[PDB]
Design an enzyme around this catalytic site. Structure first.
Site, PDB file in Angstrom:
ATOM      1  N   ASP A  35       0.967  -1.132  -0.086  1.00 31.18           N
ATOM      2  CA  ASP A  35       0.212  -0.135  -0.093  1.00 31.18           C
ATOM      3  C   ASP A  35       1.074   0.956   0.304  1.00 31.18           C
ATOM      4  O   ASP A  35       1.326   1.769   0.550  1.00 31.18           O
ATOM      5  CB  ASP A  35      -0.675   0.188   0.887  1.00 31.18           C
ATOM      6  CG  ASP A  35      -1.664   1.384   1.257  1.00 31.18           C
ATOM      7  OD1 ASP A  35      -2.091   2.111   0.640  1.00 31.18           O
ATOM      8  OD2 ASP A  35      -1.982   1.454   2.566  1.00 31.18           O
ATOM      9  N   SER A 199      -0.171  15.185 -12.399  1.00 29.85           N
ATOM     10  CA  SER A 199      -0.729  14.561 -13.674  1.00 29.85           C
ATOM     11  C   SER A 199      -1.234  16.631 -14.478  1.00 29.85           C
ATOM     12  O   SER A 199      -1.612  17.406 -13.695  1.00 29.85           O
ATOM     13  CB  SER A 199      -1.879  14.166 -13.652  1.00 29.85           C
ATOM     14  OG  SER A 199      -2.335  14.434 -15.334  1.00 29.85           O
TER      15      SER A 199
END
EC number: 3.4.23.22
Length: 330
Positions: A35, A199
């Site tokens: 994770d 992004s």
């Protein structure tokens, strides 16, 4: 040193991925959910409330000659999906894919919430976010990667998750045969303890690329791709009959649909998520309404590049003094 371990989807939907981890002496092998969105290594154990164990493999510290109670230490964690777990702490030897850390904090669950009990395939979590998020008190503990880093050939790990197939976590090296083209690296903020990056935009299907900054986290422990409501609406508008359902808890679409791809930007590079990766199947057995793999992050407070996005790429988690992320097509 290096390590290399195969990671395997837990079910036919890629709801999560499990990686075998050796704990203790003699080794006890548990299948953990790696994770990158959390920083605790915790396991089902001989200390877990018996009614809360249903098929998981347990760590039994009393059977490990290298286990030592970390006196006074406790832990308690709550995840973004509302699940939680808590307990006490041992140190022990932990190995992943041939890479060994001695003295790793192994957090033994005394209590787990119902969603953990109900998932017999996940024996615990191995956190790979920054150690500043580790929940152990009164002395915070380091992640497996943080403990291994100095010994690694290069201070990196990589995630290469498969679509409906196994993939690989590598530690300490970049397998240049595992991706196509070049790796594009992008800046990371560690201010929230996550692999947080920006992004450069997105496209839906064959549509034009929209240049827009999307701050979010690379999170192998989250199944889906969570993005701003504007972006998610633009995606699902291209699917006839798709709608956001308050009763189901997100966007659903007709199971008869063919889904468009979704592209996200990494600097000037582009990662294409095929439409099939965005299908999470019937909302309930036999239903013709299917659950979408791109969902709104509104209300979550952060955008999450979960497995739907990451499995379309070869992803480098670069833990150099100034961390960065790398993405390549594959």
């Amino acid at each position: 040193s290096t390590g290399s371990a195969t990671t395997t989807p837990i079910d036919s939907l890629d709801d999560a991925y499990i990686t075998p981890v050796q704990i203790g002496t003699p080794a006890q092998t548990l299948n953990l959910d790696f994770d990158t969105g959390s920083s605790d290594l915790w396991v089902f154990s001989s200390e877990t409330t018996a009614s809360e164990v249903d098929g998981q493999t347990i760590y039994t510290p009393s059977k490990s000659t290298t286990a030592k109670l970390l006196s006074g230490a406790t832990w308690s964690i709550s995840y973004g999906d509302g699940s939680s777990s808590s307990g006490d702490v041992y140190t022990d030897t932990v190995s992943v894919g041939g890479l060994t850390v001695t003295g790793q904090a192994v957090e033994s669950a005394k209590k787990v919430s119902s969603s953990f009990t109900e998932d017999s395939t996940i024996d615990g979590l191995l956190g790979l976010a920054f150690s500043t998020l580790n929940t152990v008190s009164p002395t915070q503990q380091k992640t497996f990667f943080d403990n291994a880093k100095a010994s690694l050939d290069s201070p990196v790990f990589t995630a290469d998750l498969g679509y409906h197939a196994p993939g690989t976590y590598n530690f300490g090296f970049i397998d240049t045969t595992a991706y196509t083209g070049s790796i594009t690296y992008t800046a990371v903020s560690t201010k929230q303890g996550f692999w947080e990056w920006t992004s450069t935009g997105y496209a839906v299907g064959s549509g034009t690329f929209k240049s827009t900054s999307i701050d979010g986290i690379a999170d192998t422990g989250t199944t889906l791709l969570y993005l701003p409501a504007t972006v998610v609406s633009a995606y699902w508008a291209q699917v006839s009959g798709a709608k956001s359902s308050s009763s189901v808890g997100g966007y659903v679409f007709p199971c008869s649909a063919t889904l468009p791809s979704f592209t996200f930007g990494v600097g000037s590079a582009r990662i294409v998520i095929p439409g099939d990766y965005i299908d999470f199947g019937p909302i309930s057995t036999g239903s013709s309404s299917c659950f979408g793999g791109i969902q709104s992050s509104a209300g979550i407070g952060i955008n999450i590049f979960g497995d739907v996005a990451l499995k379309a790429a070869f992803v480098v988690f670069n833990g150099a003094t100034t961390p960065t992320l790398g993405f390549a097509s594959k």
